[PDB]
Design a protein around this ligand. Sequence first.
Ligand SMILES: OC[C@H]1O[C@H](O[C@H]2[C@H](O)[C@@H](O)[C@@H](O[C@H]3[C@H](O)[C@@H](O)[C@@H](O)O[C@@H]3CO)O[C@@H]2CO)[C@H](O)[C@@H](O)[C@@H]1O
Lengths: 365, 22, 151
Amino acid sequence: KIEEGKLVIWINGDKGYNGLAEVGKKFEKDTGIKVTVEHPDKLEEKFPQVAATGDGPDIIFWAHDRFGGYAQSGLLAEITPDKAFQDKLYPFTWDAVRYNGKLIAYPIAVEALSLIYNKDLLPNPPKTWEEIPALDKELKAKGKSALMFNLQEPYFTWPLIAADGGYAFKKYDIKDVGVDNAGAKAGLTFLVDLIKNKHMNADTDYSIAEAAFNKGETAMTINGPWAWSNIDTSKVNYGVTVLPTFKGQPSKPFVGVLSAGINAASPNKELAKEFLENYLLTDEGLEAVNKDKPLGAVALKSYEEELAKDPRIAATMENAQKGEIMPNIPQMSAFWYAVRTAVINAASGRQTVDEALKDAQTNSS
Amino acid sequence: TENLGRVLASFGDEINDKYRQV
Amino acid sequence: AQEDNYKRIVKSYVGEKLRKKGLKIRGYEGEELKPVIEIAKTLQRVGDELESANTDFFKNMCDQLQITPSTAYPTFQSIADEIFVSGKNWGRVVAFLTFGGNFAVHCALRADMGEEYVDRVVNWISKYMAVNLDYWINQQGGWDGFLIFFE
Ligand SMILES: OC[C@H]1O[C@H](O[C@H]2[C@H](O)[C@@H](O)[C@@H](O[C@H]3[C@H](O)[C@@H](O)[C@@H](O)O[C@@H]3CO)O[C@@H]2CO)[C@H](O)[C@@H](O)[C@@H]1O
């Protein structure tokens, strides 16, 4: 609960919330301001509910794509860094958190999905989606599978859907939605055919795909930098590389910018700015979080330089450059909800690819 | 807050001006 | 390290103020400090000169800030930044310490702020000097220069 003189922070359970707490510890030691970091489920769905009533956390972490909706609801405070601090973060990251001429959050790091593969099981990762079925048939004969990744969240399937022409919007035209065009159908259909041919299972979720890969049961998974920590712990000899192409076109993952917004109803708004600018968004601050769960390519120029040498980050950048930064408009939540239903229904066989995407085209308005 | 710090800096200038031997 | 060096001076300055007002704070029970006290003596002297020439400002300083547990530290940082935004001189260092001392002795012991804020503010003052002022201070000869400048 938000009392005066304390910071409550929400951040999703797959990020490094423990490392963020030790940044909060350093903050309390200097300021006497206790920091409590929580990782509740459906954090992004609860925040608009409890913030609307003037409750919730002081600080909310999430990909930038959700903050436009929060902003137009009046749930986020305008953030007003001075030029000296604004110069410390890349301008394109600031762009991701600008809404109707407002900075509405602090950018933290750039996130892009990459192909993660087991070198012991698969020395040369496949360059194309098309060659995975044949690869799975060789691996199944030896008791393994080629690929498992989260099929319950459309984030992990959008790269294939967009590969051949799928897009969300279009400055941003909400009527022009590219969810049921020929490129989207061709991508989702390839996914469905993979399931029909028993190369994947519709019910695979994040935890199943992670356990399967980190236990050496599958040769490839699709995930972001936050997941590398557990792979290290599992000792799997892994690599991170460009996503597979589809119909000669690169996979186009939707690029997220982990951002920290300040609750407009919080009485601790200035305290949140001190913590975020002067403890989190420093080299030492981001390192603490990164050492718990890798952040990707951070928005801080000084620390991004230090990590760019990492080949895993470089592979992340390649996939990022071949992708597209997510819009932050409020309509993004409806788009996601719509596309989540279409992937699950098509994968499980409750709808065909066509009627699944048409409903999503409509629900995306 | 803004003008409180500016008024304090003028107070500090008055003191620096006094002890200035230069 | 260096922050500790500044806290020693700030602690004694705030401790004497606390005892004049009559308070008995834990950690500030007395002055066992004994050549370093010469810094303390100069700071109390010139600090007292500055507030005795602007009494009504310091008498009503807390009433204008209306400090709460939410705004105490941000208000401190903002006011301190504004003291030195257009430059530094020994007189402004003093102004900053008299602001801090009164901030810890008076505004920090208001009903809605407990005794625990005395040591917090002393730490805020110390950290600020070590982070933002230490370069200029050692440029001007450190505390030895502070002493020579004010006699
Ligand atoms: O999936 C975990 C992984 O993906 C995250 O991307 C998500 C977007 O950031 C998010 O906006 C999401 O949209 C979801 C809604 O916001 C949410 O309320 C949910 O209930 O419905 C949507 C998902 O069905 O879209 C993707 C996920 O599809 C984020 O970038 C990663 O950091 C995160 O770890």
